[PDB]
Symmetry: C2
Subunit: 106 residues, 2 copies
C-alpha cells in the first residue's frame, strides 16, 4: 500500500503541496471542455499529487471553490454572469472520480 | 483490507446488487436538499453497498444518469424543464466524495 507509505511520509505542513495542487487545478479548469488540450494529462497530474499529499476530499473541493472564486474575481463576473462557471461542476466530478479510482485500483 | 476481501467475494453477476443500489440512489435524490430527511443515512447506505459490491465509479455515474432520466420521464419534463434536475450534480459529488473517503480511510 503506497497510500500507507504516502500517509507515513506526508509533511505536517502541506502548504507548499496545496500551492502546487492549486496551480495544477487552475490549468485543468482552463483546459476543460477544450479540444486539442490534454486536460487528461493535467487531471492525472493533480490526482497523482493529491494521492501523494494524502489530502482529503474536502481539501479538493476547497481548491475547486477557491479557483471558481478566483476566476470570478479575475474576469470581474457580477451576479448572473457567474453562471458561465457552473459547468465546471463536471470538472470537479471528473477529478474526484479519478481520485476515487486511484484509491480503488491500488 | 476489506476492499481486498469484498473484491474477492463480489459476484460475477452484479445485477441484483445494481438493482439495490439504484433503489437507494433513488431515495437519496428524493431526499436531497430536503431538511428533516436524513439523506446522510441513505448516502452512507449507498456508499457501504457500493464498497461491498466493488462497483466502479463509472457504474455510480451510470446509476445517477439512469435516475435523472427516470425522474424526467416520470415527471414528464420537456426541454428546459429538465433544468430543475441540474442541482443534483451536487448530490453526485456528495456520493462520489463519500465513496472516495471510504477507500481513503480504510
Amino acid at each position: 500500500s503506497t497510500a500507507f507509505f504516502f500517509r507515513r511520509m506526508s509533511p505536517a505542513d502541506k502548504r507548499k503541496l496545496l500551492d502546487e495542487l492549486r496551480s495544477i487545478y487552475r490549468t485543468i479548469v482552463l483546459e476543460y471542455f477544450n479540444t486539442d488540450a490534454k486536460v487528461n494529462e493535467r487531471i492525472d497530474e493533480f490526482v497523482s499529487k493529491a494521492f501523494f499529499a494524502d489530502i482529503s476530499v474536502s481539501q479538493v473541493l476547497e481548491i475547486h471553490v477557491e479557483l471558481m472564486d478566483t476566476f470570478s474575481k479575475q474576469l470581474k463576473l457580477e451576479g448572473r454572469s457567474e453562471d458561465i462557471l457552473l459547468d465546471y461542476r463536471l470538472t470537479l466530478i471528473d477529478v474526484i472520480a479519478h481520485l476515487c479510482e486511484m484509491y480503488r485500483r491500488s
